[PDB]
Amino acid sequence: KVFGRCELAAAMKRHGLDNYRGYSLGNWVCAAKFESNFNTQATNRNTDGSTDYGILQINSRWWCNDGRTPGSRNLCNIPCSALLSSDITASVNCAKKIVSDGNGMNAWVAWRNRCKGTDVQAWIRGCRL
């Protein structure tokens, strides 16, 4: 599913991501924009052989099981395929664990490089939330 901008903001809020660990909704929408362009089916293969999955490009080295990432963990206790669903529940629940791991949203390199320090409120501007 490719979400609309406000549609995704609303879904993220529904699932308790808004201001989670102090990160406003615009941060999360911005991260999703640059990780996946709001496409739940997004996948990308990393140099180390791990793969990133879903709207927030969650990585199989630590967070989910794909059966093809040697030496990896599955800390969200989910198949990586769950992160591709039109229902963002699994991605949100896993993201909550990731952002609580110590480095906040810096875990998403694209958030650090493209969202951090910017006017992230622009991502939810106009949205009925």
Per-residue x/- marks for Cl ion, 8-27, CB under 5 A? ----------------x-x-
* Least gap, CB of 67 to Cl ion (angstroms): 5
Q: Which of residues 87 and 103 has its CB atom nearest to Cl ion in the complex?
A: 103
* Rounded Cα gap, residues 123 and 52, in angstroms: 23
* Rounded Cα gap, residues 129 and 52, in angstroms: 29
Residue 101 is labelled as binding a ligand: yes
* C-alpha neighbours within 13 Å on the C-beta side of residue 12: 31
| Residue 64, phi then psi, degrees to nearest 5 | -145, 165
Part in contact with Cl ion (CB under 5 A); list of ranges 41-49, 64-72, 78-86, 97-105: 64-72
109 CB burial (10 A radius; 0-12, 13-18, 19+): exposed
Q: Which of residues 14 and 87 has its CB atom nearest to Cl ion in the complex?
A: 14
Binding of Cl ion by 69 (CB under 5 A): yes
Contacts with Cl ion by CB under 5 A lie at: 24, 26, 67, 69, 72, 110, 113, 120-121
